Amino acid sequence: QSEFIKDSKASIELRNFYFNRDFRQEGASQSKAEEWAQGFLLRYESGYTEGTIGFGVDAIGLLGVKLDSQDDYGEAGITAKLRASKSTLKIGTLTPKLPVIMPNDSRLLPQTFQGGALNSMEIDGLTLDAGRLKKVNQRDSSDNEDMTITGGGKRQIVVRSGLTSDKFDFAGGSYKWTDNLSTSYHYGKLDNFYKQHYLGLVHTLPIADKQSLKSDIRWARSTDDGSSNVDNKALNAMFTYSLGYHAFGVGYQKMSGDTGFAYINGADPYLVNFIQIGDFANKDEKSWQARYDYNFAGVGIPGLTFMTRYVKGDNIDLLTTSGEGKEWERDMDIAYVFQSGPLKNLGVKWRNATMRTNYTNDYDENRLIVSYTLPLW
């Protein structure tokens, strides 16, 4: 009980989420949206009881309330935790972080899942996972529901009418060959929707200090599971050369097969050119990204960061008409974290995006996220 209490943590987060969206047609505004919401996030994580098999429990209290634009939404979640040696089993509310499932947390409240998961690190450098998710609790929702696949746009994903799934199975692993090179292999199956094999290779190469080249290479094969037409290969890689407080990144992404990339509806796709508005994951879509980061600590104003990126996509199959679909997006992020004063740790982040296409709706979008986390101890 010494670790249980001592490793235990609790916190309350205040979270303010604002966004506006302007649909552009010609050089004019066709329509606008605005959402404003306040969040209260209560988190608790126990440590583990002593012994061969340790037990712990996590609890989550998420409350969202629309400020303007059911008014109240959110969820309460409990998770039982078991740990033997270096293997941990979790049952209940899960938020896995894997190439085959990246839960959304870009709005007010996180997307969460119900199920059971196993993470294992018994062997030096080897990390294994496996699990089953049964239900998803979307970010704007109040309870748990069957999962579906991300559809729409020109993804050209087609599914049996009314189809839903209460089984997403996953298993995988990753191995650190050196402290600079790891590879990963991950499997995910959304029952009746798709099967997916994800391969990864991450290489960080220090030229000197402080200079580094990170190579992030990825490849996923997705295939149908009886009741969809899913058929996709996704090659996507990012190269990020870091020097001092600058980082310059280049990304490449290519869809092929009869549909775009397959991923749980509501989640984020693990793709290098997935950005603020577009995922550039339509049928046949190829896209290139250029990204620049600067961290103002490099001078005066620690806690202030800048980021901008540009992504250009083409070769999109328009599906019902001939011709090449093209789209492009530019993002600009500015983020500040108070380093001192009574406001310390208060976080504020502005995310700005422009999306333009030659075939569908264009819009601009601004997000302001204000965040403050207070430990209860």
Residue numbers in the entry: -1 to 67, 87 to 394
Quote the study that presented this structure, word for word.
To determine if the phylogenetic subdivision of Occ proteins exists at the structural level, we determined X-ray crystal structures for seven Occ family members (OccD2, OccD3, and OccK2–K6). A comparison of the crystal structures suggests that the division into the OccD and OccK subfamilies occurs on a structural level as well; the OccD subfamily members of which structures were determined have much smaller pores than those of the OccK subfamily. The pores of the proteins within the OccK subfamily show a considerable variation in size and shape, suggesting differences in substrate preferences within subfamilies as well. For OccK channels, conductance values are on average somewhat larger than those of OccD subfamily members, ranging from ∼50 pS for OccK4 to ∼300 pS for OccK1, OccK5, and OccK7. These data are consistent with the fairly large pores observed in the six crystal structures of members of this subfamily. OccK channels, on the other hand, appear to be less selective and facilitate passage of a wider variety of substances, with a preference for cyclic compounds.
In such microorganisms, the majority of small molecules are taken up by members of the OprD outer membrane protein family. Here we show that OprD channels require a carboxyl group in the substrate for efficient transport, and based on this we have renamed the family Occ, for outer membrane carboxylate channels. As expected from pairwise sequence identities that range from 35%–50%, the Occ proteins share a similar architecture, with a slightly off-center constriction formed by the inward-folded extracellular loops L3 and L7 and residues in the barrel wall. The transport data demonstrate that Occ channels have a pronounced preference for substrates with a carboxyl group, due to the universal presence of a basic ladder on one side of the barrel wall.
